[PDB]
């Protein structure tokens, strides 16, 4: 059973800058003290990301956006609202659907032909007499039908909490769809009460390499709502950006982890740094390989 709880408020998406976010490890080999150059789907530095936040002010919004080539995800978290996604192509009818979910202790991955209503949510019920809270609710899909794939593992979204103060749980994700393999990268970084993508660097670790092979064009993010304007609750804000085919140059530190990445298509200084393969450049003339224009 599902219900028309839209209460959608229309506001323009406040485009904001990520400042050198969205880079991951391109390969599964331990290098160190090297400047390996790679060409892969990466979020470009100083790129427009979409600040989506449906809360504060009964403002609820959760539109269907295009997976394009990849989807950089962030989830500055306060009270565990973002619970998963429903990647797919049509998200209804007779087509194949993906229902990436992060449960209370595990991660359930199902690629199947689910039917979806317009406003999917996960509803948690709290009782006074027994106090047990159960996820025994399913309103993202009405039912499931002629199903193909199921996967249970350790959950992606991990607390990493217990520490105090102003630090926040910034949860980063990278989704890409290549050779029918939905690759998922993630890392979690504490941030000292920042209201914007932090000024630092990220190293997104590989999590799963799912052998799915399904068409994914219009993805969407699940949320969790309590019971209690029926079925409303929480507080959340997340940020979505898209990966494009670019070229980066990564410098590896002495621990084997990346320190900083120098893009090859934003600034003339970065193009010269890319075409000379070094992170320090002196004064002079540096002929640059051509990455400025793409037809």
């Amino acid at each position: 059973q599902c219900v028309n709880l839209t209460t959608r408020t229309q506001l323009p998406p406040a485009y904001t800058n990520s400042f050198t976010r969205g880079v991951y490890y391109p390969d599964k080999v331990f290098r160190s003290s090297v400047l390996h150059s790679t060409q892969d789907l990466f979020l470009p530095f100083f790129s427009n990301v979409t600040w989506f936040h449906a809360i504060h002010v009964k403002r609820f919004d959760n539109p269907v956006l295009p997976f394009n080539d990849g989807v950089y995800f962030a989830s500055t978290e306060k009270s565990n609202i973002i619970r998963g996604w429903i990647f797919g192509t049509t998200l209804d009818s007779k087509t194949q659907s993906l229902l990436i979910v992060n449960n209370a202790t595990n991660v359930v991955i199902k690629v199947c032909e689910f039917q979806f209503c317009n406003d999917p949510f996960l509803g948690v019920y709290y009782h006074k007499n027994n106090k047990s809270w159960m996820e025994s609710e399913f309103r993202v899909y009405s039912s499931a039908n002629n199903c193909t794939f199921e996967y249970v593992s350790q959950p992606f979204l991990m607390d990493l909490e217990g520490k105090q103060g102003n630090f926040k749980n910034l949860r980063e994700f990278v989704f890409k769809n290549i050779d029918g393999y939905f690759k998922i990268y993630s890392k979690h970084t504490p941030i000292n009460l920042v209201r914007d993508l932090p000024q630092g660097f990220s190293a997104l670790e590989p999590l799963v390499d799912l052998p799915i092979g399904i068409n994914i064009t219009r993805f969407q993010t699940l949320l969790a709502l309590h019971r209690s304007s029926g079925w409303t609750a929480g507080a959340a804000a997340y940020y979505v950006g898209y990966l494009q085919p670019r070229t980066f140059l990564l410098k590896y530190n002495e621990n084997g982890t990346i320190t900083d990445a120098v893009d090859c298509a934003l600034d003339p200084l970065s193009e010269t740094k890319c075409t000379l393969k070094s992170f320090t450049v002196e004064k002079g003339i540096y002929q640059t390989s051509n990455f400025r224009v793409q037809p």
């Epitope: 009270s79 565990n80 209370a104 202790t105 595990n106 948690v124 709290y126 027994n130 106090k131 047990s132 809270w133 159960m134 350790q154 959950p155 991990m158 607390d159 909490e161 217990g162 520490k163 105090q164 103060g165 102003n166 309590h226 609750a233 929480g234």
Partner: antibody
Framework: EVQLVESGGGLVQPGGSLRLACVAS????????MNWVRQAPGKGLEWVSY????????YNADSVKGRFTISRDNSKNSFYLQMNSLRAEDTAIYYC????????????????????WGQGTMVTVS | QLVLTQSPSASASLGASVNLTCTLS???????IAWHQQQPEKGPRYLMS???????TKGDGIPDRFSGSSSGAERFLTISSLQSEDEADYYC?????????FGGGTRLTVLG
Amino acid sequence: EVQLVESGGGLVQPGGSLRLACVASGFTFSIYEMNWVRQAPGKGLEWVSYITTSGHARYNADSVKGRFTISRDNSKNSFYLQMNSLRAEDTAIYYCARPQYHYYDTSTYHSYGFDIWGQGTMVTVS
Amino acid sequence: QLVLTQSPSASASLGASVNLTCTLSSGHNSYAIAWHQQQPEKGPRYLMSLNSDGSHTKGDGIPDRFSGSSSGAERFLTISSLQSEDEADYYCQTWDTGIRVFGGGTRLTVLG
């Protein structure tokens, strides 16, 4: 009703292995991570180890010399301290307590401090 | 880790007022605590998780008599109109990255 009952006492020479448990009922374990606390006789209580809701373990507090191990069987609705290598100082009460931060929470995260405590068991070791 | 300079013995008259003190290391000035009362020969009882601003989160069966206050990097628990049951051990504990702390306990020999 929330309650934390334990069992698995025993007298052994140092280096022996026993079976400690914290059975509970009346509330969800899936969304509650559990801690362990050690209280030497006449001394202050000191936590030893804990397991998270997902399944990750922390054998911290540097009093455990790689001797204590924690696990959990969510299927059987029970909580075990995977126990081996008891030593002389380990003769103490082992109050197991349930943290206030359940996984489906609101408000500020002034939680993970224990709201309830088990009755505790005395595991005498010499 | 943080150390608690809580007096091993503090006392006052019954029906009077006292103030317990939980001291905390300067490195974690804005850190919060929670108070556990360990009545002797029984289990611990949780009173309040004290915010850095003195806000309250209360356990069952504890009246408004037991209250908490904060000032600087150190913390207080307030008791007014003392009764017979106060002779017990009080433990102030904290949070970290997987590292609880707890304290020596506040054996309290309220004379009366």
